[PDB]
Amino acid sequence: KGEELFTGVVPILIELDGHVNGHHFFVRGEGEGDATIGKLSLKFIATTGKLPVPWPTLVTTLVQCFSRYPDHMKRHDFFKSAMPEGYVQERTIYFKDDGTYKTRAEVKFEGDTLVNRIELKGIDFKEDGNILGHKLEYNFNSHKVYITADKQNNGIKANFTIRHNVEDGSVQLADHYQQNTPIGDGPVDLPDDHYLSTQTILSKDLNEKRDHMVLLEYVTAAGI
Ligand SMILES: [Cu+2]
Ligand SMILES: [Cu+2]
Ligand SMILES: [Cu+2]
Incomplete structure (x- = not known):
């Protein structure tokens, strides 16, 4: 339909x-999103056994269409306007003094479900660094995701730095560079500069034997 797709609670599949x-x-995650209040509630399983990287390094890669855009900002919501056909979301993530992730995702409706299917490639990580050495705390900070229009590509870009708490009290920074392109050829909303304000809790399911991550997230658009 459109932004009409997000007026209620929407089931989610992430792979x-x-x-x-x-x-x-x-990794496969399942759960629900409620864009009217900007809330995600998801459970992720590593189907391949214990992950080679910390769960928190995957959070950003694992549906910004569920951000709450306040009424006065609805003209700037690229993510929902691309639906149902969806958008391609690509990132290059530089972990400071540490390797890089390259991601490519398609985010679109498959029936009544919003699906995010991702390919991730990581290279040049240090065997004894914070990522391969699993030295990151199981939690997640608040960020501002700065969004700009990319009118030459009929989409948007985003810039932000993720701050991962390290077990010794230091911080591991991860510079994110993001590009989104609509899949469909219908018109989309190309926004004025703004940002998304995020909050996230990472937790566990006591009955789950597999390596897993329960996620609760709230995101609201601001800056206009
Ligand atoms: Cu209708
Ligand atoms: Cu493989
Ligand atoms: Cu192999």
């Missing part, structure tokens, strides 16, 4: 096919 250094892994 990540990952290769970091020499390691293969697969």
Whole structure:
């Protein structure tokens, strides 16, 4: 339909096919999104066993169409306007003093479900660094995701730096560079500069034996 697709609660499917250094892994997440209040509630399983990288490094890669855009900002919501046909979301992520992730995702409706299917490639990580050495805390900070229009590509770009808490009290920074392109050829909303304000909780399911991550997230657009 349109932004009409997000007036209620929407089921979500997320699938990540990952290769970091020499390691293969697969993640599938399921749950629900409520864009009217900007809320995600999701559970992710590593189907391939224990992950070679920390769960928090995957959070940004694992549906910004569920951001809450306040009424006065609805003209600037690229993500919903591309639906149902969806958009391609690509990122290049530089972990400071540490390797890089390259991601490509398609985010679109498949029936009544919003699906995010991702390919992730990671290279040049240090064996004893914060990522391959699993030295990141199981939690997640608040960020501002700065969004700009990319009118030459009929889409948007985003810039932000993720701050991962490290177990010794230091911070591991991850510079994100993001490009989104609509899949369909219908017109989309090309926004004035603004940002998304994020908050996230990472937790566990006591009955789940598999390596997993429960996620609760709230995101609201601001800056206009
Ligand atoms: Cu209708
Ligand atoms: Cu292999
Ligand atoms: Cu593989």
